[PDB]
Coordinates of C-alpha atoms and ligand atoms in Angstrom, one line a residue:
Chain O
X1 CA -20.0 -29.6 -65.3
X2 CA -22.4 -32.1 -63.5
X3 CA -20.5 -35.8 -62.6
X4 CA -20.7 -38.5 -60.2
X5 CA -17.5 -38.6 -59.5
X6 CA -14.0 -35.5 -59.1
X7 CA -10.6 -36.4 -59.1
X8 CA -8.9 -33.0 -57.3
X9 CA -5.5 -32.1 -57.2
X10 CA -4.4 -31.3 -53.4
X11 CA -1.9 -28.6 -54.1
X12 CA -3.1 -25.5 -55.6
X13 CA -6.9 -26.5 -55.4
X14 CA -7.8 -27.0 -52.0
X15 CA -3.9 -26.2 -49.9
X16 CA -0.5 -24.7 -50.3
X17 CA 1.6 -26.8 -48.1
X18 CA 0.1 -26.8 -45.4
X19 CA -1.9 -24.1 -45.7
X20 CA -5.6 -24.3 -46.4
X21 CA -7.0 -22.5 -50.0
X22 CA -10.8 -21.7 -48.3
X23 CA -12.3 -21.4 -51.3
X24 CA -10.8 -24.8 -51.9
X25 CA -11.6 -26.2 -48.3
X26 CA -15.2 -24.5 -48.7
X27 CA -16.1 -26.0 -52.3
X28 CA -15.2 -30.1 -51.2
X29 CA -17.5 -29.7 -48.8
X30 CA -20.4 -28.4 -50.9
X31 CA -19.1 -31.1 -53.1
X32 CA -19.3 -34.0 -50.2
X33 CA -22.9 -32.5 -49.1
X34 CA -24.4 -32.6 -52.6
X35 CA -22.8 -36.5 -52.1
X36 CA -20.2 -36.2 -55.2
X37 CA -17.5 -38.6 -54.9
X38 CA -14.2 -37.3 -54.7
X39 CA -11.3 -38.9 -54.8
X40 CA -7.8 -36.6 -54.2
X41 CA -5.1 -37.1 -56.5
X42 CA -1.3 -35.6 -55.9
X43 CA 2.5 -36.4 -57.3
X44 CA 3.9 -35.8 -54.1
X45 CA 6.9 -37.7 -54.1
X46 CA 8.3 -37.7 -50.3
X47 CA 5.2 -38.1 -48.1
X48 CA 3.3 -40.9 -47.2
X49 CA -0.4 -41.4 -47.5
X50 CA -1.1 -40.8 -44.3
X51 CA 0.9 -37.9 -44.2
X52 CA -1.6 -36.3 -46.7
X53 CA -4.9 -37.7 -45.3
X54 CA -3.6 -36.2 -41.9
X55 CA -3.0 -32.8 -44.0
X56 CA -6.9 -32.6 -45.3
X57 CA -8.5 -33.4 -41.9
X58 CA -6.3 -30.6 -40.6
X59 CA -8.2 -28.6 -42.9
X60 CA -11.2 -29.3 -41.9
X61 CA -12.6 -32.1 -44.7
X62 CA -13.6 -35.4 -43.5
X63 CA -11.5 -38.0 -45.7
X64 CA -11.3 -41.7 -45.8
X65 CA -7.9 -43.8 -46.5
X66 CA -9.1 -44.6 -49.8
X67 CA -10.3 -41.0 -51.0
X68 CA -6.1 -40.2 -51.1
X69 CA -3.9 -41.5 -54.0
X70 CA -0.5 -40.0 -53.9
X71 CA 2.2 -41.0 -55.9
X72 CA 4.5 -42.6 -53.5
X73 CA 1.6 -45.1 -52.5
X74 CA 0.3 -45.1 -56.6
X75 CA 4.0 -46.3 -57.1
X76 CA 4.6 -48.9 -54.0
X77 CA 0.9 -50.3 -55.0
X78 CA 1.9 -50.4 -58.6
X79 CA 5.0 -52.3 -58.3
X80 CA 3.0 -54.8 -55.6
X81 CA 0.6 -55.6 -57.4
X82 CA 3.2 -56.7 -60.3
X83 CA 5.6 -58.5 -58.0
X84 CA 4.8 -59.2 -54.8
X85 CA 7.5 -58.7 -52.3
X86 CA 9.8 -57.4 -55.1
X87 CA 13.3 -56.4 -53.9
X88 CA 13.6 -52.3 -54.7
X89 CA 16.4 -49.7 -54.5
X90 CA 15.0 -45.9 -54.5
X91 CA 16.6 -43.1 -54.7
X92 CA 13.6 -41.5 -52.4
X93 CA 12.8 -39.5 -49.3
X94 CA 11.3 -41.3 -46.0
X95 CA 7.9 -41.2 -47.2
X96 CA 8.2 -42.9 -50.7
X97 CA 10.5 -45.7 -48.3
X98 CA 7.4 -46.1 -45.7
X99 CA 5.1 -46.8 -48.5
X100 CA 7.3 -49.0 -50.8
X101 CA 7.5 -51.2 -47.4
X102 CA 3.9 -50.6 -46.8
X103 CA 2.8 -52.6 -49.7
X104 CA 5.2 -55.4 -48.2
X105 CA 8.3 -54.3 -50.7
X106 CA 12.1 -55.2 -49.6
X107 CA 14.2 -52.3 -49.5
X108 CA 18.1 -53.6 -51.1
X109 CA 20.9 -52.1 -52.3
X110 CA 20.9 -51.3 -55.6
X111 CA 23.1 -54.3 -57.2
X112 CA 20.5 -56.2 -55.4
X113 CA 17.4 -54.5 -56.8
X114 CA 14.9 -55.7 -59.3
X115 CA 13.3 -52.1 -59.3
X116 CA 14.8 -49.4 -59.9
X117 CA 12.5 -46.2 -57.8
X118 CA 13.4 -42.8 -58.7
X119 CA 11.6 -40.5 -56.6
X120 CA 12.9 -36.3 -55.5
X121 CA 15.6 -36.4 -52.7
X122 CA 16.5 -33.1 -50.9
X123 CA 19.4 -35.3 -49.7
X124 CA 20.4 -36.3 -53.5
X125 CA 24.1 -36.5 -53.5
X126 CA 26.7 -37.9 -55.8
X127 CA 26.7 -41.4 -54.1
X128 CA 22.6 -41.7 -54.8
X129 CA 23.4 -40.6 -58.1
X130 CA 26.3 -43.1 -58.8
X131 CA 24.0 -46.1 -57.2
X132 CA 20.8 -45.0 -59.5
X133 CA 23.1 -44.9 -62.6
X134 CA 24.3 -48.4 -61.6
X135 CA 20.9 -49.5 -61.6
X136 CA 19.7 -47.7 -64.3
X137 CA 22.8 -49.6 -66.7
X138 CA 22.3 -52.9 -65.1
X139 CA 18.7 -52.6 -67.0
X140 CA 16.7 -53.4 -64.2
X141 CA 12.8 -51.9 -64.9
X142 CA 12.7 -48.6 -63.9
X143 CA 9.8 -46.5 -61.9
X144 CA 9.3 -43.0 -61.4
X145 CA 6.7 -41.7 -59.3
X146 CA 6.0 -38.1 -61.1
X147 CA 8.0 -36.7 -64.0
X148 CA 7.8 -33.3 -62.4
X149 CA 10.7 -31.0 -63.3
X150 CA 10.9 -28.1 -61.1
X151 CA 8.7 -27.3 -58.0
X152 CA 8.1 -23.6 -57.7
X153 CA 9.2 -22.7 -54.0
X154 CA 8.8 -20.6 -51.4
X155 CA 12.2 -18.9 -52.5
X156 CA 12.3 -19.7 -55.9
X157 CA 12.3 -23.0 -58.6
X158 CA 13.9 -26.2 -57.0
X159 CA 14.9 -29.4 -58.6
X160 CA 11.6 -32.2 -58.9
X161 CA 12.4 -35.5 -59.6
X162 CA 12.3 -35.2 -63.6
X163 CA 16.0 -33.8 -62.2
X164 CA 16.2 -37.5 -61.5
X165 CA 14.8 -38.5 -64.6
X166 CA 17.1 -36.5 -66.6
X167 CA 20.5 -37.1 -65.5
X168 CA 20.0 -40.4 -65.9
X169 CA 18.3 -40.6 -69.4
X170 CA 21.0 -38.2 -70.5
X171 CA 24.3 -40.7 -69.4
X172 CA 22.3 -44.0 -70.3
X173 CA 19.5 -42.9 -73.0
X174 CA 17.2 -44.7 -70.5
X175 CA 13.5 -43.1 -69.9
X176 CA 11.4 -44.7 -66.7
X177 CA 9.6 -48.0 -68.2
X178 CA 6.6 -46.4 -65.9
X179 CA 5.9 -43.1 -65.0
X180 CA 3.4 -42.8 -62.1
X181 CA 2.0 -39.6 -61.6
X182 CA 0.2 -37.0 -63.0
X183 CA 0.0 -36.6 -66.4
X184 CA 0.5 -40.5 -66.3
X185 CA -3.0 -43.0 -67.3
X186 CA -1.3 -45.3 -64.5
X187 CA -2.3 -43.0 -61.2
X188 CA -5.3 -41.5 -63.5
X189 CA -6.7 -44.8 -63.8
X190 CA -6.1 -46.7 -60.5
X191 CA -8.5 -43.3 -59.4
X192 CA -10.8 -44.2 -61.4
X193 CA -10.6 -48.1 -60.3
X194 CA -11.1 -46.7 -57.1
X195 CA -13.7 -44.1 -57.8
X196 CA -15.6 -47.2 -59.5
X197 CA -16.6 -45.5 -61.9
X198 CA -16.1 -44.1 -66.0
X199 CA -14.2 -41.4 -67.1
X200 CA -17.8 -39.9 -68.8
X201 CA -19.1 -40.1 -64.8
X202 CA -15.8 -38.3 -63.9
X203 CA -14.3 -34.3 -63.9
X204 CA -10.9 -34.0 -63.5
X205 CA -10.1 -30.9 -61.3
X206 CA -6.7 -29.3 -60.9
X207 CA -4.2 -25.8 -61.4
X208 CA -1.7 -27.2 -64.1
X209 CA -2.9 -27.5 -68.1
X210 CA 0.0 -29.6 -68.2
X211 CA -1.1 -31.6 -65.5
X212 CA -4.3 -31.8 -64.5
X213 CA -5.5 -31.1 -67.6
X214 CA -3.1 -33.3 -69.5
X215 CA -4.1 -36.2 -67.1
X216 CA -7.8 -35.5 -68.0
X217 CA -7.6 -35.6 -71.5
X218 CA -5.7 -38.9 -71.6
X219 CA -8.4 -41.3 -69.8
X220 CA -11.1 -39.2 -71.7
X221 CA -12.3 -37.5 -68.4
X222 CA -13.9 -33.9 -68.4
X223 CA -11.2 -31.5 -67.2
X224 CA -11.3 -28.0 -65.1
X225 CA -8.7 -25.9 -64.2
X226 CA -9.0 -23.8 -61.0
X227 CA -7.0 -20.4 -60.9
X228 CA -6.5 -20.9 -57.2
X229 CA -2.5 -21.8 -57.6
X230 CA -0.3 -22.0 -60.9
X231 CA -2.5 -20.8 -63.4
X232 CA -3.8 -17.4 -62.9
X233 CA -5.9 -15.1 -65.3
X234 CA -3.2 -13.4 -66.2
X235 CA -1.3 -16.4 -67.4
X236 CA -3.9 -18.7 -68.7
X237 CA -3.9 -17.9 -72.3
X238 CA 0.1 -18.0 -72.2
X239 CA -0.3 -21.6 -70.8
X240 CA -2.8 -22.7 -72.5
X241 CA -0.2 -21.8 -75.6
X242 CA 2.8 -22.9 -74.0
X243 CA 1.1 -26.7 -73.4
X244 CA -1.2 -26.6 -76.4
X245 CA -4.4 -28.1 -74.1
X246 CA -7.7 -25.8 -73.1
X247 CA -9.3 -27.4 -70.5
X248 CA -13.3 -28.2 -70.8
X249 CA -14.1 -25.5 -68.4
X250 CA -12.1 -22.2 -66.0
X251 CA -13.1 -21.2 -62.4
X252 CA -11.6 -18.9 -60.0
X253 CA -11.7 -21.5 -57.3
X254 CA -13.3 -25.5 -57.0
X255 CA -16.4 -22.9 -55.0
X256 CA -17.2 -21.2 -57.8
X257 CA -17.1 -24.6 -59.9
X258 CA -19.5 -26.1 -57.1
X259 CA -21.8 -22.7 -57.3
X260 CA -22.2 -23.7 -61.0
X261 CA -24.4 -26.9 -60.6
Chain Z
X1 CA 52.4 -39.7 -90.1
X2 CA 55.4 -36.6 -89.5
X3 CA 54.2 -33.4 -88.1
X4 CA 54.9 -29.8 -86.6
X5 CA 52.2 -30.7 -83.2
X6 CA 50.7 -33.4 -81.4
X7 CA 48.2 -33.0 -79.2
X8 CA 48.0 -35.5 -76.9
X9 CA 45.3 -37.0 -74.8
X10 CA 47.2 -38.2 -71.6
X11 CA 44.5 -40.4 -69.8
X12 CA 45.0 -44.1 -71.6
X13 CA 48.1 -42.6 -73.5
X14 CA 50.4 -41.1 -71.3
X15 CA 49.0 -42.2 -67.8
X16 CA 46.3 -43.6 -66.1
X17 CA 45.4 -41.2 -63.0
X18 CA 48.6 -41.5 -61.4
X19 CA 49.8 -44.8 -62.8
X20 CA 52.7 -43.7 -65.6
X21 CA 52.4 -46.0 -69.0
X22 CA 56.0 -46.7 -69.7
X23 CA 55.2 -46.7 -73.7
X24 CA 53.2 -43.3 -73.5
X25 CA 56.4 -41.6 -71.4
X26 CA 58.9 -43.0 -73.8
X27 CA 56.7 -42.0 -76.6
X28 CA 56.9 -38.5 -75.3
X29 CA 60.4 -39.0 -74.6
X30 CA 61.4 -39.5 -78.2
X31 CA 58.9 -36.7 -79.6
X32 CA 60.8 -34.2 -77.6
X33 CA 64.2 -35.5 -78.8
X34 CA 62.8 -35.1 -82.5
X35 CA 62.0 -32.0 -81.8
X36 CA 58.0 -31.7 -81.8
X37 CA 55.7 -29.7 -80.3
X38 CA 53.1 -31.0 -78.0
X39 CA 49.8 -29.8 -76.0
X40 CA 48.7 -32.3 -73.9
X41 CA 45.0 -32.2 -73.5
X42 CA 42.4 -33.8 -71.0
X43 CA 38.6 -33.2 -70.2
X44 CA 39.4 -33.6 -66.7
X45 CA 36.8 -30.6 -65.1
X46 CA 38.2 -31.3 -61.5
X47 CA 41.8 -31.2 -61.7
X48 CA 44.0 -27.5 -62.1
X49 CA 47.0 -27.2 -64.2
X50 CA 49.4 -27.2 -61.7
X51 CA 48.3 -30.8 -61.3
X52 CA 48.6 -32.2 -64.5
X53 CA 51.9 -30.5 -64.7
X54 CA 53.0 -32.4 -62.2
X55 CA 51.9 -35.6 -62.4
X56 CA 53.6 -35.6 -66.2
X57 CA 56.6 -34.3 -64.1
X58 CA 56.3 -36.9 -61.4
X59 CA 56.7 -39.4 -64.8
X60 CA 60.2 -38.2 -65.5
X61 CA 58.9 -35.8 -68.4
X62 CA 59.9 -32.2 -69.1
X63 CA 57.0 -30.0 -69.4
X64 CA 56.3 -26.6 -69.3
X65 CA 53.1 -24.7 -67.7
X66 CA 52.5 -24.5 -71.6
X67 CA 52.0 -28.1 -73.0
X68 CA 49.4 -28.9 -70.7
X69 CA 45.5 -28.1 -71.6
X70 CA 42.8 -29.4 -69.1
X71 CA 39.3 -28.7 -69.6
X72 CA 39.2 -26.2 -66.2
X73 CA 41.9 -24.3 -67.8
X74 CA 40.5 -24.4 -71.1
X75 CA 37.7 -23.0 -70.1
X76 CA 38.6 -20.2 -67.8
X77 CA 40.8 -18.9 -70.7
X78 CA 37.4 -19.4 -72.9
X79 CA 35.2 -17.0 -70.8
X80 CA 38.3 -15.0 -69.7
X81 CA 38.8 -13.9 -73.7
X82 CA 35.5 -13.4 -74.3
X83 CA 34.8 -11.6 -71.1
X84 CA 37.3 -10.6 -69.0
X85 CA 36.6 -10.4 -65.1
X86 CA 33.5 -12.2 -66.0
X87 CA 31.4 -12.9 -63.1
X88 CA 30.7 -16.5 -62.8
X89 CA 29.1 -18.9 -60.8
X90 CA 30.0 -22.3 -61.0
X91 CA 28.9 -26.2 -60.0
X92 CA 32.6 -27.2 -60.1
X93 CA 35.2 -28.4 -57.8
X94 CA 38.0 -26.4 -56.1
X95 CA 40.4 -27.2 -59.2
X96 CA 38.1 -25.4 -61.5
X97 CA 37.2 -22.5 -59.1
X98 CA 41.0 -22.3 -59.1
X99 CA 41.5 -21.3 -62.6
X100 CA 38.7 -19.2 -63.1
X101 CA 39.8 -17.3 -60.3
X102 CA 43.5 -17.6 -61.8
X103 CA 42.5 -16.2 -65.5
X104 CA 41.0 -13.0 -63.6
X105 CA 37.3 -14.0 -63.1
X106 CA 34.7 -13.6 -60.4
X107 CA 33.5 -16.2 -58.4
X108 CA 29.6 -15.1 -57.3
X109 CA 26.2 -16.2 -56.7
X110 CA 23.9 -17.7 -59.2
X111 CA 21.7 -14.6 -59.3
X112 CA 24.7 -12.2 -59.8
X113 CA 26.4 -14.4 -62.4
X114 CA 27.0 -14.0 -66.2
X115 CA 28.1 -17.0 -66.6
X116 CA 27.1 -20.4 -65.3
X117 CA 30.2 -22.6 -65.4
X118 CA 28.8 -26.5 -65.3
X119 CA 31.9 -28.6 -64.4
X120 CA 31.4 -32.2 -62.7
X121 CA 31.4 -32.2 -58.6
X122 CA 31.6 -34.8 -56.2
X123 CA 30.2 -33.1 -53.8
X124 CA 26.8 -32.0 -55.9
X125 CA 24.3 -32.0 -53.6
X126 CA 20.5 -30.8 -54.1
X127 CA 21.5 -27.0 -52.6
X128 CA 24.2 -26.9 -55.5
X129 CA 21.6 -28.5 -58.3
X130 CA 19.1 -25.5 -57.3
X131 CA 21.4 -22.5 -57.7
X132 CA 22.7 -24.1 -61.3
X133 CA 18.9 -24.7 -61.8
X134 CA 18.1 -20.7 -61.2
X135 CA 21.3 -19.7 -62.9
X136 CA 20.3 -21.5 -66.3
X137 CA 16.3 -20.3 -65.7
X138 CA 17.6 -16.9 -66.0
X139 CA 19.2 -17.4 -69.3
X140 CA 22.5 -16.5 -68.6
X141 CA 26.0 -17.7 -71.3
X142 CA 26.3 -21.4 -70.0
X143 CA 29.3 -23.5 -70.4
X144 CA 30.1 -26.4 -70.0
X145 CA 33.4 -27.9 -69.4
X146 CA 33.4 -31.0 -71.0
X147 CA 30.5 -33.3 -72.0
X148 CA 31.6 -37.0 -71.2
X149 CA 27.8 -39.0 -69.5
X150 CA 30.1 -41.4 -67.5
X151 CA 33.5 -42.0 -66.0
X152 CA 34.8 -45.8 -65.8
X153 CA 36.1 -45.4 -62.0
X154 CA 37.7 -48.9 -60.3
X155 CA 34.3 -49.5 -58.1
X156 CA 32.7 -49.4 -61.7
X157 CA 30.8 -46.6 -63.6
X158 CA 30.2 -43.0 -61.9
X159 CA 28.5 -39.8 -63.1
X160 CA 30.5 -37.7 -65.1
X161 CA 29.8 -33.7 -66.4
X162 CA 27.1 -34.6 -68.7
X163 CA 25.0 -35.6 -65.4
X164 CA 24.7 -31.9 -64.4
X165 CA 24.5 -31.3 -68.6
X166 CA 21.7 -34.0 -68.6
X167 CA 19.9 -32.7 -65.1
X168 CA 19.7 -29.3 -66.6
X169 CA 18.9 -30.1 -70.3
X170 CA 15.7 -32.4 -68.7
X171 CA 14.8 -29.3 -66.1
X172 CA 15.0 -25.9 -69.1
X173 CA 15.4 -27.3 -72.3
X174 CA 18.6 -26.0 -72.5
X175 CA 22.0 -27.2 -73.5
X176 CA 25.1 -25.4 -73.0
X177 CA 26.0 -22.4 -75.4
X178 CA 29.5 -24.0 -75.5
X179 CA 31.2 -26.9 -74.7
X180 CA 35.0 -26.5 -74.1
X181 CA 36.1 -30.6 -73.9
X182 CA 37.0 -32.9 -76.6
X183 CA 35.1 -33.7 -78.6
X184 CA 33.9 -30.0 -78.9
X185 CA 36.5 -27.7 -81.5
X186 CA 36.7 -25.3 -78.7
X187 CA 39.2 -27.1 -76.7
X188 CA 40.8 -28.1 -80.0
X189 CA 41.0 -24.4 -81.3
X190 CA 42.6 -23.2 -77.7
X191 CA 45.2 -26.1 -78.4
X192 CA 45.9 -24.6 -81.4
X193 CA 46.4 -21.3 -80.9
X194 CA 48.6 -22.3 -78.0
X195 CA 50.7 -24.0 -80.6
X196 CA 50.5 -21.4 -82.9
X197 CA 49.6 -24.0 -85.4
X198 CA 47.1 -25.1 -88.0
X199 CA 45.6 -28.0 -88.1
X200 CA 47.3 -29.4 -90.9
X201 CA 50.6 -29.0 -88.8
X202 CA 49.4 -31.4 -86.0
X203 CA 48.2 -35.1 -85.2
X204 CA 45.7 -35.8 -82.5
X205 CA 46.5 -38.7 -80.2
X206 CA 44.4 -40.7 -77.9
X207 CA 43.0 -44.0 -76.5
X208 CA 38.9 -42.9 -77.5
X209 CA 37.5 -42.5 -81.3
X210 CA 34.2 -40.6 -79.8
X211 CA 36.4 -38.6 -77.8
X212 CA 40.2 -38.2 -79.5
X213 CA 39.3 -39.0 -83.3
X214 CA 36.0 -36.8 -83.5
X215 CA 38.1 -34.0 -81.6
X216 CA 40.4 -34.7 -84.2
X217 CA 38.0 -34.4 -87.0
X218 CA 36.5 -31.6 -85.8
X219 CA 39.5 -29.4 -86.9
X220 CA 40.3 -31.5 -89.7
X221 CA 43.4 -32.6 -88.1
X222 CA 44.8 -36.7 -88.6
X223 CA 44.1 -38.5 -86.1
X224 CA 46.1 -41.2 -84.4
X225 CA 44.3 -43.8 -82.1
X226 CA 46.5 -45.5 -79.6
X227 CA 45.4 -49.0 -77.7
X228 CA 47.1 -48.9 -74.1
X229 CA 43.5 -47.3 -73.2
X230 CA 39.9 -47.7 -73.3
X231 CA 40.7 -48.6 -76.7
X232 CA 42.1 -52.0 -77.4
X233 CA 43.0 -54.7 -79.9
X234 CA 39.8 -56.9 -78.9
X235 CA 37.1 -54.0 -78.6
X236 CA 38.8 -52.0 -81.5
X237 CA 36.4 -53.1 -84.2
X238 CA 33.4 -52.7 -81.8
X239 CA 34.6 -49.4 -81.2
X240 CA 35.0 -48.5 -84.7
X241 CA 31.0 -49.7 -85.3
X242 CA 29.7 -48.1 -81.9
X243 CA 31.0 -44.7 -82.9
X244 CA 30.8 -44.4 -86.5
X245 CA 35.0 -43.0 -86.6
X246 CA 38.3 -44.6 -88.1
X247 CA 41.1 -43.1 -87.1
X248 CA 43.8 -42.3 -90.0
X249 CA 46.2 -44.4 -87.6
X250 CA 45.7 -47.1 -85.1
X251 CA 49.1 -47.9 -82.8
X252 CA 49.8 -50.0 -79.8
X253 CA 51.2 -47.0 -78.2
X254 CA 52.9 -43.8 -78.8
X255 CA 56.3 -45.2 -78.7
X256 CA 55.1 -47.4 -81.5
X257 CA 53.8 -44.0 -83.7
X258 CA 57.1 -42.4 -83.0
X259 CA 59.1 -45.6 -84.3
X260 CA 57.3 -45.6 -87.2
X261 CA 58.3 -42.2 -88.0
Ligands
CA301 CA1 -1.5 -28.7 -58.4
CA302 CA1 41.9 -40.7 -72.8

């Protein structure tokens, strides 16, 4: 399981929220000292970049700017580097809004727009709703940061943005044009771009089959699934069924995957 | 075109929102005086009885609690039939929780329902989209009070029932168990047995083909499409081609169906 180069998922692998998985916090740092790139890789839809770089040195890991791709800066950087100062209308928390601006987008109102940004809301309400809809039928291109469904909670399951997604394929028959995140080859391959390096060179490191393990079987990258957060041992072989993917190789925790090289 | 029933769409027909259409109420007018029965039938998943009753009232027309069958009604009798005292739990608006509560059921939480009751709400807000969300996860009956994607409002197009529809189909892979509204049978079979007719006994009148003329079909009853809607002389061939439906009849308006019989 020997590469130059990891792509990690955050959540699950190395924290819940923001609380640190040891195991997780332990086995990057093995990882850093045996001088394996790493590059973390999450759909969070709501936070900034800095938010989540500011989360990992809380735990304890030394992390660089450019070692963090998360999906609200994948999708600002995305839409950037396509049209420069392009005028965008999102149906978004604060932190997908900081980092659309951050890559010198201009925030309009949706009749305005020339991107349509559907990212999760906790604020979602009918007005959003009837403004993305708008959007969506004026046939503007259309973004999604992560095609998530449900995000299982402290309490219990809660909307992700695929509820986004959803409602609005359903009234207009329109899917995103580009889906960002995780299992997506756009945010899997702007890692590697950064990473520098080939998917042969690269493991793919995560808790989800139809995630992680989807996103590493897409750009041909080595994939390992962690049992850490959403997969467990007792559910494994149900989700590797249920998703129809096995993943190259199963640890308990990204330290036992370290203590095997 | 002579028969025992009508049932009779009354947005595009009869009325728009509050606005009388002179044609529809004298239509109506000389139904009565020829001594026909008549349901009138709307999807509308917001609005009670009561109100319907008496906005055709407030349009000069004599109508009993009887002749008027909207969706919220429609489906509280559904679930009350099947189940009565049903515990439900719904997304919809105060005009729906009014007749569920009216036909004898139980208004409760999502966990204690046995029925999730999806009706549109212009209030839905993420809280309400999670308890829906745990309500359909658990499996429990799941209706749905009418299916329509989008309502044409005056600022321009807004979500209609089918978002929540959509938003949950996207989220569980499920659909509702049953749709009540047009162009679902079920609304059509409660009209029905309200009339204490068959369908050969009745005409189905409205301003919509996918909505009026495939409810129609659905019981095998004729249908009659009427133009002082969303259906008009210009768009009528369009209409016809978009939908894949010809009504039996096409009039201006429902005066002009009860001249010619
Ligand atoms: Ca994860
Ligand atoms: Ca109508």
């Amino acid at each position: 399981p020997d590469k130059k180069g990891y792509i990690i998922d955050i959540d699950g692998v190395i924290g819940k929220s923001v609380t640190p998985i040891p195991e997780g916090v332990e086995g990057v740092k093995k990882l850093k000292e045996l001088g394996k790139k790493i590059i973390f890789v999450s759909n969070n839809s709501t936070r900034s970049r800095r938010i989540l770089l500011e989360r990992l040195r809380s735990f304890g890991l030394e992390v660089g700017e450019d070692e963090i791709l998360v999906a609200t800066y994948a999708t600002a950087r995305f839409i950037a580097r396509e049209k420069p100062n392009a005028k965008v209308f999102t149906t978004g928390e604060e932190g997908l809004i900081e980092e659309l601006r951050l890559a010198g987008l201009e925030i309009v109102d949706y009749d305005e727009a020339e991107y349509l940004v559907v990212g999760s809301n906790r604020k979602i309400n009918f007005e959003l709703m009837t403004k993305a809809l708008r959007a969506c039928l004026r046939g503007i291109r259309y973004i999604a940061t992560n095609p998530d469904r449900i995000f299982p909670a402290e309490d219990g399951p809660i909307p992700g943005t695929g509820m986004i997604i959803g409602a609005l394929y359903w009234m207009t028959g329109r899917e995103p044009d580009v889906v960002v995140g995780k299992p997506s080859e756009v945010i899997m391959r702007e890692a590697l771009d950064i990473l520098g390096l080939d998917a042969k060179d690269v493991a793919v490191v995560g808790d989800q089959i139809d995630v992680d393990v989807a996103a590493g079987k897409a750009i041909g990258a080595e994939t390992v699934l962690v049992l850490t957060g959403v997969t467990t041992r007792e559910n494994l072989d149900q989700m590797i069924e249920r998703h129809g993917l096995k993943p190259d190789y199963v640890f308990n925790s990204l330290k036992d995957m370290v203590e095997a090289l």
